[PDB]
Design a protein around this ligand. Sequence first.
Ligand SMILES: [Ca+2]
Ligand SMILES: [Ca+2]
Ligand SMILES: [Ca+2]
Ligand SMILES: [Ca+2]
Ligand SMILES: [Ca+2]
Ligand SMILES: [Ca+2]
Ligand SMILES: [Ca+2]
Ligand SMILES: [Ca+2]
Ligand SMILES: [Ca+2]
Ligand SMILES: [Ca+2]
Ligand SMILES: [Ca+2]
Ligand SMILES: [Ca+2]
Ligand SMILES: [Ca+2]
Ligand SMILES: [Ca+2]
Ligand SMILES: [Ca+2]
Ligand SMILES: [Ca+2]
Ligand SMILES: [Ca+2]
Ligand SMILES: [Ca+2]
Lengths: 217, 217, 217, 217, 217, 217, 217, 217, 217
Amino acid sequence: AVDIRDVKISFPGTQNPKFPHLRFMQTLPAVRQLTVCQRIKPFHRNTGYIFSCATSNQDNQFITSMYVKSDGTLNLGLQVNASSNKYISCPIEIELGQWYHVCHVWSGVDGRMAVYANGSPCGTMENVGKGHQISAGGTVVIGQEQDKIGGGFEEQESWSGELSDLQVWDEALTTHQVSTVASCNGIRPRGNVISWMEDSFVADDGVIVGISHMCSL
Amino acid sequence: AVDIRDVKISFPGTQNPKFPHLRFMQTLPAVRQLTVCQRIKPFHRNTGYIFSCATSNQDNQFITSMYVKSDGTLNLGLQVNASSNKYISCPIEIELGQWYHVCHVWSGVDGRMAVYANGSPCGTMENVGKGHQISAGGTVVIGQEQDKIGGGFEEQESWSGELSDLQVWDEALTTHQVSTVASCNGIRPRGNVISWMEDSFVADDGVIVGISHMCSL
Amino acid sequence: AVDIRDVKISFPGTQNPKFPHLRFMQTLPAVRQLTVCQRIKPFHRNTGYIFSCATSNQDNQFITSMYVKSDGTLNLGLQVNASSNKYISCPIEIELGQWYHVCHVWSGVDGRMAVYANGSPCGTMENVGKGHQISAGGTVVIGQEQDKIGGGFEEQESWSGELSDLQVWDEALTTHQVSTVASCNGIRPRGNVISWMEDSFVADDGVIVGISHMCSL
Amino acid sequence: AVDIRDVKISFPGTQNPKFPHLRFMQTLPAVRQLTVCQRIKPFHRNTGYIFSCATSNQDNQFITSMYVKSDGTLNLGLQVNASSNKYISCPIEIELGQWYHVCHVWSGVDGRMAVYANGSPCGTMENVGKGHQISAGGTVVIGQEQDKIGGGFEEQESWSGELSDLQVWDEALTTHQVSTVASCNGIRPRGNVISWMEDSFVADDGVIVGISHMCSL
Amino acid sequence: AVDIRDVKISFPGTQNPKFPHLRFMQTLPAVRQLTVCQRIKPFHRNTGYIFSCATSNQDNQFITSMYVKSDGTLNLGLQVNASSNKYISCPIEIELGQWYHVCHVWSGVDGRMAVYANGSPCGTMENVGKGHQISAGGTVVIGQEQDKIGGGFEEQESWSGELSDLQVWDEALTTHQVSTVASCNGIRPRGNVISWMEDSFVADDGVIVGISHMCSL
Amino acid sequence: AVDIRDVKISFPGTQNPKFPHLRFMQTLPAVRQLTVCQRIKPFHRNTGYIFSCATSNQDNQFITSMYVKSDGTLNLGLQVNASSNKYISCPIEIELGQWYHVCHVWSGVDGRMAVYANGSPCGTMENVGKGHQISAGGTVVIGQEQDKIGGGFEEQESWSGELSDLQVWDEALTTHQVSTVASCNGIRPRGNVISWMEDSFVADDGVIVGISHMCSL
Amino acid sequence: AVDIRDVKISFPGTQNPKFPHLRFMQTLPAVRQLTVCQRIKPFHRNTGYIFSCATSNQDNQFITSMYVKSDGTLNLGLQVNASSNKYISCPIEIELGQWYHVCHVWSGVDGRMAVYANGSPCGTMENVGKGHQISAGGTVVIGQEQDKIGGGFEEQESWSGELSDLQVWDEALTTHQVSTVASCNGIRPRGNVISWMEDSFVADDGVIVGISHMCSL
Amino acid sequence: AVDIRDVKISFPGTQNPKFPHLRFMQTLPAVRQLTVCQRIKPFHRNTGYIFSCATSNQDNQFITSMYVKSDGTLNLGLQVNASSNKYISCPIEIELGQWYHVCHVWSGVDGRMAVYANGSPCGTMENVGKGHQISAGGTVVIGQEQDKIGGGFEEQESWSGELSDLQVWDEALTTHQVSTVASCNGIRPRGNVISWMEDSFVADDGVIVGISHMCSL
Amino acid sequence: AVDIRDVKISFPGTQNPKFPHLRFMQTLPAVRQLTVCQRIKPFHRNTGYIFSCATSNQDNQFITSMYVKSDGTLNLGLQVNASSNKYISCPIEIELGQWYHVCHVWSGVDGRMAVYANGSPCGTMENVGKGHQISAGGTVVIGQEQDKIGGGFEEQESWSGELSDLQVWDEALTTHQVSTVASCNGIRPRGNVISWMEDSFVADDGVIVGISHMCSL
Ligand SMILES: [Ca+2]
Ligand SMILES: [Ca+2]
Ligand SMILES: [Ca+2]
Ligand SMILES: [Ca+2]
Ligand SMILES: [Ca+2]
Ligand SMILES: [Ca+2]
Ligand SMILES: [Ca+2]
Ligand SMILES: [Ca+2]
Ligand SMILES: [Ca+2]
Ligand SMILES: [Ca+2]
Ligand SMILES: [Ca+2]
Ligand SMILES: [Ca+2]
Ligand SMILES: [Ca+2]
Ligand SMILES: [Ca+2]
Ligand SMILES: [Ca+2]
Ligand SMILES: [Ca+2]
Ligand SMILES: [Ca+2]
Ligand SMILES: [Ca+2]
């Protein structure tokens, strides 16, 4: 049968008061490094936030985002501890309505940031949350940007499209690791902090549950 | 990895205006026979409707329901074409918070009804929608009873608990077939009209997505 | 994948001017013996004709029919060269909306007739078309009784239900052969005069094409 | 035995009031992307519509069509939401009465259109239903162009020839995927929204059911 | 594919001036023993000659024949050197239009005669051509009785039905050998003087060539 | 044992009133394309017709023929719907008394004609029965040209020689298919409309039945 | 090498201000059922708490405990939502300084309680937290009883001994499941909420890390 | 399952009076050579001591340390018998928050010192404890520098980061050996004096126990 | 080659000032349970001490001893924390100069004592060091009884004979474990605190090193 990792979620589109999203049941432990990967099929070209981690006193602990520009260039962004969104553009032309594997690697130890598109690195950046350590209790929401724990959504910050195979590690995966994670036929590794479908989450406001044909047809 | 059929959905509990439920994307074709099976972990002992099929002019086309009585006896009910809920009790003591495999087999050809609990038949009944044929376009909702297409929910008719491996055939499976469907280690067959996780559906109002440990530990 | 022999056709029901049926492209050679087998899911209990073979000057060359009685007894009928329908009842209780394998064996050589239900013989009969030889050019229609080549249907003579795995031999199969033909897991033999799905036919008036779950689930 | 995917349907030719065609039993869910592939043996060189998807208030939701020009060039057309037929010509000379594999890929997300002939791309086009999303409930008819749900056929818009292995996905398959879909000896994938022979359909007005010798001889 | 030994010939029926029959190209060597076996599906119950061997001066060198009596008993006859037909009845009830394996074993050395039905002996007889030796040059005709070399047929002596797997040895096979020859799944031995299909023969007057379903279905 | 496909028929030679020939029991369905292949050992160098298909109102529906010219060149002809024999010469020198594999491919869809000699194409031709569709009920005769259904033979139009492995498809096989059909050791495919030895036929006027040593020695 | 599940922790013994214990990094999601299993080597015979789950406003959310009586009888206790310790004695004589596998199964759905010793059930109890649902954010501490989140330890409530293979599920495992969990050579399943060694935890006050020789020697 | 050698310990960071560290239960025998290897993920760039061996009268018997310089160069230090820290820089740029395998090889026999980074030698040094022999009874502490047996920690001398697969031999491994020790997929050898996880140790002050993803993902 | 575990040591016999013995290099960690097993070939029948563990303030921390009585009965003794030698006699007749496997199991947790002879238990005893915990730093001497750390030997307390396969665990092995340890062909387990030949020791005063033929010949 199809593999559990090929299950996908669809974020139809936001418009107050409907905010399709996902909220994980368990909260994240305290972490000082983090790698978040997932397969995405973007719908809009404007900025939208995908992964949102918020604590009782910092709704902007960790937030991954993206936006495509006119020439079709992919721009992956990361914000740590209410900082400003830092972006890194990838040498790939995006086609709205298509699948892509993306990873964000963050290391508060030295404040390094690295984003990957399809197993290939796009580039790194520094002074991104350097010295910062996400407090324990992070609540995770997908497809919406929290301003309140698991709430306070702004339709203009939401992200629409399809998503699946979300994996998260509290370690900064190396460039050679990231590539084994993105490959479809690879060994398909699982995150230690969050393994797609293995860690339960909550759904609301019309998310569609289906299957991703990116890897298997 | 875990199999896609072991994914489960949790229906936390209803209380206006929150109605956790599922609504399938595709509507059912016109059918004159129907077998609906699924694994369930009931939470409450009072009547709740699980499978609800409604058309633009008959919100009560097909509705499976259940309720446990004081002695712990399982009672599976079926209602066809706005008829009255017909019940058949099973020779098994239910334990709220535990897994059970259940099937409802309906044949409008002769109006026969048969319900099974864990691959074993509980009994049959007659004159249940005899001669009736569910019109094409049936909309399916899980965990809520529709009074309107995909809506008009009544908190008192909702069903809470956990559910998974929902399979549906537009044929009246035989007693020997039903048993091969319920077994965990069996060949695990898939429904032709609805295959759990293979046919996409919509989620709203806090359903929890996780994994069922009934079959595999 | 599912086997080609598991394809089924559904005959919704007749009502002038709609006569759902099938008409084979090639006509039958001249034959003096004939075995017609197929899997059927009857809808009505009243007489209906399944296999109809008609020539330019005898629309009643060969016609298989059936009807269930009050007690649920199966009655298989055969008519040869405009004779009268001869019936043989089988020791099995029919359940409208269920699958059954049936065969009609006719031998104009001695005029013997034998009908089987699920690989088991129901009984034989004599003086049924004895000495008769169906002329070459027989046109075959399924689910309707011809009074004209490929036409002249009477809605009261039509047969509704589901059908599949239709096999036809111009030889009178033995009782031991018929049994290997009816078994699902058996070698599944194919008719030499007509092999289900292998010999093309024409469809009209709303027959539904799908798949039979009698053998494979 | 021959594989179920090799079953073919023949559309003899239209002439009021006879409109040979197929109508699928289940209606399409709401989709915003779509890939329709199938093997075809064209009879006429003039425009004819193959796949027709119509909703209660837009009989022109999605319609694939084709026509061969004097020099034998294949022209595949697509029309979305009552737009005008957009065509893309392929670098292949058509031979009426021969087999060809064809795919139409549409993505309302960015309005992109791509057509393939025998696993190879013919070219793409833009602004084709951009932003459009086919409403849920699409009724599909093959070999006829609907002006009414499952009706209102115009013999000048009908398409004749032979067809088989019709596969449909609610995702925009990639160019590398389309190629594995068209190959005969390939893994032969099945559509998630419509799998030839697996999803039941209705037949009327003389369609011939047989077998395609394109792949297997 | 089907085996060459399963090819069958049909002798429709004689009526002056039409005499369906077979005539072997090569003539038989001089023999003093002979075993002739073959599978037959009799049509009429009256006497008919199957194997006819004639020389330029004795049209009645060797002739096998059969006839069924009222109670359905099989009677196999043999005539040697213009003697009178000697018969031996078999303990089996014949059913016109069915297959049976038959052998005639003759030994001019001691004049013994033995006939078998389905690998089992029916009985022996003596003083049948004792001391006789069929002269070289015997011409063989099937389904007709010669009064002239390869001619002089009498419609009343013809034999109708189906025949196949004709084997002939110039040795008197033992009872244990005959049984290995009759079995379908056995090693299927071939005659040394005549091997069905291996030794060419001539056909005239409407014999039908087809395939026997006695052994393989 | 030798394969059933290696059985051959010999057409000794015609001379009124003797017309050695074969007539198939079942008639051909209505077809608009046709591929007829067979192995032949020609005896005479003058024109002779091999495959003759006639309907109740057109004795010249489809007729394959051949003739060798002085330099030994093979000329394969085809006539459709009483048209005139169209010929295509092959780049091979024929040797009367030798085996050759030949195919005629006809497509009434575009009126194309193609003939092959030993798996290799000799050439194509156009405007051969374009738009024509052979009516249902075609009677097939081998080695004689019908002027009447199964009769009206003219000794000057007869064809003598040996023939075997006759295969017929109601589809226009491609050039790559034709080659797999002609090879001896190949997979040896079977025609869907007529499979040598599998579809019964009638014989008269001295045809010799034997075995072909073209493929196996 | 030794398996990761055989790692053990030693709780030397408490004496203010030293409180050897473990505190898991991630907090428990909200749960309404729970199965906690682990291998233990008890040191003292008096009551000691092993598993302690505390939330911001209920330090007594879930607490497993045990004590051995004079006759060596094992007594497993459970306390839910500040209730009173409920005990169930097991039919086994404990030997301080030896290994034992223990499981606590709780289901707030019906308030059922069941404890096991070495894969065998000791007995069940009711009205234990019935209707209760542990709030999300439970902090888990091992070997100490919290009166404050991750603190407020009372040396008289601490538990000493050795522990390993701690597994936790948010489902109420069945009696048949518990048995496969306790066996050493079994498949050794892992908890979905807490998998020994897989989910990180914090150590303080002298816990000894080593290896358990209960299973492997 | 994950291998026992992949268990890691995290040293959060020191700040009086909290001194996260490890103290092995068994003391080191008397040794005159020593190889200490382990996988480390450094947090700070300033000097920190990792391995500390102290006896009743020399708290500075053996101490491994490291520090990264501005340009990211790794500097591994060793101190023997209260000598001064001798350093050797490695040709590798360190990235705080990443994994590296490191070994210190010391031989009091000739006073040679050699340090390796990732299986490769960085360089050697001499006159380092030449003639010295560590007295029996060495107590080992990790992540803290002892000034007292198992105590007297100075927060400015502590080392933070993650560590795992600590192996120790009382022999001076060769350069070829060190390389097989550092490889992940290698045979993974174990130290004879200290084998990670195999020899028990004590934990205090918040060390985190988890798993290293350096080798296995 | 012979296995390392079959190496044996011979204790010739003591007589001041010669005290043949062994002293392990590493000292024992602090333990509260202990299992000491070894193969022995006794020479004298009078009491002799084998395993002696002494700390800087208790030369009598743990001492195993034995003596054979007149009837040949084996008596195994144990002394803990300067207590008095407690003995347990075994139901086996000893033969000086022969091999025997012996184990002493001590559990200070409950003060239980158990001795085994050849995998079989001889009996248990209580109140033997109950509550006692051997302090860290135990020095081990074999074949001599220490009154001083690694010294102060008394010739009358020495033990002579041959010994090998000495294994020691800081856990109280179960009776079923002890039996797998004693068997020669068994899996031959190794102690975690002391593995024969794997943990280095010192030799003096004429111990003979050789090989034991108890297990392998
Ligand atoms: Ca925010
Ligand atoms: Ca916001
Ligand atoms: Ca309702
Ligand atoms: Ca309602
Ligand atoms: Ca009629
Ligand atoms: Ca009629
Ligand atoms: Ca239209
Ligand atoms: Ca139209
Ligand atoms: Ca005669
Ligand atoms: Ca005669
Ligand atoms: Ca003619
Ligand atoms: Ca003519
Ligand atoms: Ca408390
Ligand atoms: Ca307390
Ligand atoms: Ca120091
Ligand atoms: Ca210091
Ligand atoms: Ca002493
Ligand atoms: Ca002493």
